[PDB]
Amino acid sequence: TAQARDEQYRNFLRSVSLLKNLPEDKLTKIIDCLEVEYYDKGDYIIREGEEGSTFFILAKGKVKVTQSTEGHDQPQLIKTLQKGEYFGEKALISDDVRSANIIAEENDVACLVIDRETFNQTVGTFEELQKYLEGYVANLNRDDEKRHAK
């Protein structure tokens, strides 16, 4: 049922920190425009250095965050993320290429894929959320500098 589907997505999206206080009409816009992409173990959802403008919410499974850093020939493992966490906002906020890899850690990982326009018309319309994400990205920049990210 369309209604049952939309209710399931509404309940999930309201469990995401960043989205919990969105007006109904903006949550409905996300519900209407999100897409789902599925990944197998080891797949790169995001690859450092590539262009990208999608915002992702992890809906099922776990992902690894890895990043190239000075003194290491392979990207180093920074953290892992789980259901309800999000990623890919930094390319939009920093106006940059992707700055880390996001790798599926297991099979049947599912992410919600939110394009730039949808992001801009929902999350990006609320100054409190923009300022929050600006501060979060600033902390990511601090972390990048402290580990000597390439």
Of the candidates 33, 44, 60, 78, which one interacts with ligand 6J7 according to CB under 6 A? 78
147 is in an annotated binding site: yes
The answer to whether residues 96 and 105 touch, using CB atoms and an 8 Å cutoff, is no
Q: Return the structure tokens found at 96.
A: 């940059």
Binding site for Na ion (CB under 5 A): 45
Q: How far is the CB of 30 from Ca ion (least distance, A)?
A: 18
Q: How far is the CB of 29 from ligand 6J7 (least distance, A)?
A: 21
> If 0-12 CB within 10 Å is exposed, 13-18 middle and 19+ buried, where does residue 104 land?
buried
Q: How far is the CB of 33 from Ca ion (least distance, A)?
A: 20
By the rule CB under 6 A, 99 interacts with ligand 6J7? yes
The answer to whether residues 91 and 99 touch, using CB atoms and an 8 Å cutoff, is yes
Of the candidates 35, 108, 134, 143, which one interacts with ligand 6J7 according to CB under 6 A? 143
Q: 36-75 mask for Ca ion (x: CB under 5 A)?
A: ----------------------------------------
The CA radius of gyration of the chain, in Å to the nearest whole number, is 16
The answer to whether residues 18 and 123 touch, using CB atoms and an 8 Å cutoff, is yes
